[PDB]
């Protein structure tokens, strides 16, 4: 993921990028959505606005990692791509890592709405005018948000750090599956059992 040269916004806060494959984590979550350019900034941990407030709120004590790369070739067709919605009205804010897909007509005023839009009663959702010809900042940005939790379960995802060759007949340091030591390694004639 790091040496990809194709991700615009490979940056994240909880942990260092170089030590990702150094810690064995629990079951990593992965989120996915498409968003404009102006607000990839507020997908970061701890911001407020329109999308960070009613759509996808990220906790302050965040330890995941955030991805964002431009795709103005797959999610943008002539005449617009009226297939990517986003809520812009809500009773209150949104707790971190919360999902809401209800489509009850939002009531800004103090009058009954009877499930039909009218005076001071707006529809909750809104579409994206993803025209193929827009300035940068209006083009779609596919975003992936990761999350690393320290669950009391032992671990489920380690890192593929490294494995090197072995040189025999020398006094060298070694480490086999956590069993370290020093000495000289030579071929044996034992009768190990499979386990």
């Amino acid at each position: 993921l790091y040496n990809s040269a194709s991700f615009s916004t490979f940056k994240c806060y909880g942990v260092s990028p170089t030590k990702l494959n150094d810690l064995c984590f629990t079951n990593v979550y992965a989120d996915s959505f498409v968003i404009r350019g102006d607000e990839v900034r507020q997908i970061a941990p701890g911001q407020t606005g329109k999308i960070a407030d009613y759509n996808y709120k990220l906790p302050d004590d965040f330890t995941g990692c955030v991805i964002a790369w431009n795709s103005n070739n797959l999610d943008s067709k002539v005449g617009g791509n009226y297939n990517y919605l986003y809520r812009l009205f809500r009773k209150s804010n949104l707790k971190p890592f919360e999902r809401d897909i209800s489509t009850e007509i939002y009531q800004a005023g103090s009058t009954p709405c009877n499930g039909v839009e009218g005076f001071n009663c707006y529809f909750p959702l809104q579409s994206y005018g993803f025209q193929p010809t827009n300035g940068v900042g209006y083009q779609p940005y596919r975003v992936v948000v990761l999350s690393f939790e320290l669950l009391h379960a032992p671990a489920t995802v380690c890192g593929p750090k490294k494995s090197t060759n072995l040189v025999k007949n020398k006094c060298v340091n070694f480490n086999f599956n956590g069993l370290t030591g020093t000495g000289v390694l030579t071929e044996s004639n034992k009768k190990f059992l499979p386990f």
Partner: antibody, heavy 121, light 108 residues
Framework: EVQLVQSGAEVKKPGSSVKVSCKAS????????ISWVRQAPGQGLEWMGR????????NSAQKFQGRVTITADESTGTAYMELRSLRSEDTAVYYC??????????????WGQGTTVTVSS | EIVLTQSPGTLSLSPGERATLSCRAS??????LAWYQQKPGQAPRLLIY???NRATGIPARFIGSGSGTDFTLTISSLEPEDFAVYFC?????????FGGGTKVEIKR
């Protein structure tokens, strides 16, 4: 380049019923929000109401309450704006145009072609 | 029910000059407005939405500005294909009313 093919001219009589269609050229619907605009002969425009095809929601202007009934058929991508109790002054050119699945903001950009509806006797 | 007006009603200008149409509102419509350009015997088309943005394919000569309760559409270079009736539609809330109109003629 979404198109909106519309019906043809329909002369009617006072007190009768009319039904204008706004079939979407291209197949079925999407996150639309088609709205209906009426223009009197030699006058300004006048909004009437809007429908949400896929989300199944429709309403009309306060002045047109109890008279206009907008329905949609997502199977064929055709929206109807049946109007009953036609008056002598309801003669006009009726338009349909998509305005994005919303209520406020963008504004209608792709229009139909107009359906003259002269109501007399 | 918000009401809009456009001043003036005729705005007679010769080709090549600069136009100035003002769709002054009646309430807070801060940044929700759209301008339409209807040639006679045709369907209106969108020009300027959100009072600043320009719809796709529109030539850059069309510039819109203003906010709050007083907006303005300004045309820099009047081409022969710019003489029509210009409508303003407020999109604040129910219902989405319209404006009067301003038939821009040729000055001779």
């Amino acid at each position: 380049e979404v198109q909106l093919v519309q019906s043809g001219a329909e002369v009617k009589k006072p007190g009768s019923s009319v039904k204008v269609s706004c079939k979407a050229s291209g197949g079925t619907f999407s996150n639309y929000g088609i709205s209906w605009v009426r223009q009197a002969p030699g006058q300004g425009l006048e909004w009437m109401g809007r429908i949400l095809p896929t989300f199944g929601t429709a309403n009309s202007a306060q002045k047109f309450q109890g008279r206009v009934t907008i329905t949609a058929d997502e199977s064929t991508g055709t929206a109807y704006m049946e109007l009953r109790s036609l008056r002598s002054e309801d003669t006009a050119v009726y338009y349909c145009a998509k305005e994005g699945l919303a209520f406020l903001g963008y504004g209608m950009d792709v229009w139909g072609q107009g359906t003259t509806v002269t109501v007399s006797s | 029910e918000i009401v809009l007006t456009q001043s003036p009603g005729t705005l007679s200008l010769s080709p090549g000059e600069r136009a100035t149409l003002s769709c002054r509102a009646s309430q807070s419509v801060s940044s929700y407005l759209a301008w339409y350009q209807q040639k006679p015997g045709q369907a209106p088309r969108l020009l300027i939405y959100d009072a600043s943005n320009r719809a796709t394919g529109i030539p850059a000569r069309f510039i819109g500005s203003g906010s709050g309760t007083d907006f303005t559409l300004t045309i820099s270079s009047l081409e022969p294909e710019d003489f029509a009736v210009y409508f303003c539609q407020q999109r604040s809330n129910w219902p989405l009313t319209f404006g009067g109109g301003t038939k821009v003629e040729i000055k001779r």
